[PDB]
Amino acid sequence: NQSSLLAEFGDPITRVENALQALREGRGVLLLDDEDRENEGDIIYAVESLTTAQMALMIRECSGIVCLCLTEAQADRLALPPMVVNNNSANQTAFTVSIEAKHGVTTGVSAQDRVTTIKTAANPQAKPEDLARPGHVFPLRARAGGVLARRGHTEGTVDLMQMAGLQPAGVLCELTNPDGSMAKTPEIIEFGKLHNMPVLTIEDMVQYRIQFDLKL
Amino acid sequence: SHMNQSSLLAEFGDPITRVENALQALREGRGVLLLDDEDRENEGDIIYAVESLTTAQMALMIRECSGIVCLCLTEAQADRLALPPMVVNNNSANQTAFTVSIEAKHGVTTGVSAQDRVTTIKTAANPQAKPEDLARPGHVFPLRARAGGVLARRGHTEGTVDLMQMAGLQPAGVLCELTNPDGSMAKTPEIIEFGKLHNMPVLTIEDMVQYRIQFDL
Numbered sequence: 001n002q003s004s005l006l007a008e009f010g011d012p013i014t015r016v017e018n019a020l021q022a023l024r025e026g027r028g029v030l031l032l033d034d035e036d037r038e039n040e041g042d043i044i045y046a047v048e049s050l051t052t053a054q055m056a057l058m059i060r061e062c063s064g065i066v067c068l069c070l071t072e073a074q075a076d077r078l079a080l081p082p083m084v085v086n087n088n089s090a091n092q093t094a095f096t097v098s099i100e101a102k103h104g105v106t107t108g109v110s111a112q113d114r115v116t117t118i119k120t121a122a123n124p125q126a127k128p129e130d131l132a133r134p135g136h137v138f139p140l141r142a143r144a145g146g147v148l149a150r151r152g153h154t155e156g157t158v159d160l161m162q163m164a165g166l167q168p169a170g171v172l173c174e175l176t177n178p179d180g181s182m183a184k185t186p187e188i189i190e191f192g193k194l195h196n197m198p199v200l201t202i203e204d205m206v207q208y209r210i211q212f213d214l215k216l
Numbered sequence: 217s218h219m220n221q222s223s224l225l226a227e228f229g230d231p232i233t234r235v236e237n238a239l240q241a242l243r244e245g246r247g248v249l250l251l252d253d254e255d256r257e258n259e260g261d262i263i264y265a266v267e268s269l270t271t272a273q274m275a276l277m278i279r280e281c282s283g284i285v286c287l288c289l290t291e292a293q294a295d296r297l298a299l300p301p302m303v304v305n306n307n308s309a310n311q312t313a314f315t316v317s318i319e320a321k322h323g324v325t326t327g328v329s330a331q332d333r334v335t336t337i338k339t340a341a342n343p344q345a346k347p348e349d350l351a352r353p354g355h356v357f358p359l360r361a362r363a364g365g366v367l368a369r370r371g372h373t374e375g376t377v378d379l380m381q382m383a384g385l386q387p388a389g390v391l392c393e394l395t396n397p398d399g400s401m402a403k404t405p406e407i408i409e410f411g412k413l414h415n416m417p418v419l420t421i422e423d424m425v426q427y428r429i430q431f432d433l
């Protein structure tokens with residue numbers, strides 16, 4: 001079972017603290033959501049330290065739909081409303097209109113171009129005109145309150161950044177097996193071991209936030 | 217001396233032959249690799265007929281391409297599904313005609329596995345589909361092909377729908393951009409090798425344009 005498998009990454013508190021220190025060091029982490037929800041592991045990177053190599057790993061090891069998790073305030077600053085007026089997706093995944101850097105990219109899809117787009121979007125002094133729409137990067141609006149308001153990878157991403165003391169923007173993508181099926185805990189554990197990436201769950205995060213009275 | 221692209225593509229035949237082999241591969245359920253103009257994107261996209269799309273084919277795209285797998289549709293089919301342009305004022309470099317993204321309602325879970333994307337695509341491409349069959353947003357990205365195909369707009373979008381129509385297949389195909397492990401986009405020699413290894417013909421939009429000119433006009 002999951003809890004028993006994750007044991008080798010430490011106890012739940014250790015699992016959170018290792019994830020936070022990985023992010024501070026510029027490394028990625030792998031975040032599992034609830035078993036009865038998606039039961040998927042996403043690679044998470046802090047935008048602050050995002051490299052082309054990190055992006056390239058996501059593209060070749062994950063779904064390739066690399067999303068940029070943003071606070072409401074940052075999404076607002078960039079004038080990125082929800083893609084649809086009435087979201088009826090299974091998880092209410094908060095996709096905004098898709099984006100591309102207006103300047104400094106070609107087709108938008110290379111690892112370099114996605115990073116350029118993401119860095120442009122995450123710039124504290126970005127304006128809406130810095131991004132063309134539509135494009136190949138997929139921003140997501142994180143819920144105010146984070147994982148204590150919504151138990152998604154979107155909130156997990158942003159909460160991790162804030163908990164780590166980093167700028168509150170991260171990227172995510174779902175780890176996918178070569179045959180096209182989604183990675184499960186065993187494969188996720190293996191991937192984290194291969195790539196020196198801490199693994200943790202949303203429940204780890206929730207329990208950690210509760211214990212340490214963490215408003216973010 | 218490096219030969220030009222046309223010279224590299226010569227082993228696939230002359231322009232017309234390259235299109236004819238593409239059409240036949242699609243009729244046999246195999247994919248093709250379509251290059252656009254060198255002064256446009258200069259990118260090769262894997263293209264598959266939705267009619268014969270399998271989970272294995274989709275898995276290949278996720279593994280070997282950008283993973284942003286797009287569903288090229290006719291304007292008629294997009295309107296049938298009530299899929300408006302994602303943004304009213306499109307200012308992307310090529311005005312790539314993204315609609316709002318989609319997900320099938322039944323038969324899927326999170327929408328992102330190879331099998332889920334296929335289910336979603338099959339659902340959308342069905343000639344008797346209704347808007348309500350598709351949740352929005354989702355993990356499949358439809359594109360509105362321009363009326364007139366590659367003689368009107370020289371995009372992989374139009375190339376896909378033209379290819380299906382010319383092959384006599386359901387006028388819906390899926391595309392995705394071939395990518396190298398280091399995250400750079402695959403270029404002609406890599407596209408050609410990939411095509412040889414996967415038994416997928418390689419062709420260009422210009423080949424398709426010349427074929428339509430010579431075979432229709």
Ligand SMILES: O=C(CO)[C@H](O)[C@H](O)COP(=O)(O)O
Pocket residue numbers: 033038042065067091092093140151152153154155172174
């Ligand atoms: O679907 C997704 C984005 O395309 C993934 O599930 C991603 O992890 C964010 O969604 P959520 O916050 O609902 O997990």
Ligand SMILES: O=C(CO)[C@H](O)[C@H](O)COP(=O)(O)O
Pocket residue numbers: 252257261286310311312359370371372373374391393
């Ligand atoms: O960006 C893309 C995905 O949408 C690809 O270039 C795809 O080929 C569609 O674009 P176009 O028709 O402009 O080539």
Ligand SMILES: [Zn+2]
Pocket residue numbers: 107257310312
């Ligand atoms: Zn493109």
Ligand SMILES: [Zn+2]
Pocket residue numbers: 033038040042152153154
């Ligand atoms: Zn998720």
Ligand SMILES: [Zn+2]
Pocket residue numbers: 232
């Ligand atoms: Zn002939």
Ligand SMILES: [Zn+2]
Pocket residue numbers: 236
């Ligand atoms: Zn002939």
Ligand SMILES: [Zn+2]
Pocket residue numbers: none
């Ligand atoms: Zn003939």
Ligand SMILES: [Zn+2]
Pocket residue numbers: 038091093326
């Ligand atoms: Zn999801």
Ligand SMILES: [Zn+2]
Pocket residue numbers: 252257259261371372373
């Ligand atoms: Zn294209």
Ligand SMILES: [Zn+2]
Pocket residue numbers: 409412413
């Ligand atoms: Zn070879």
Ligand SMILES: [Zn+2]
Pocket residue numbers: 280413414
């Ligand atoms: Zn291959």
Ligand SMILES: [Zn+2]
Pocket residue numbers: 382428431432
């Ligand atoms: Zn014709």
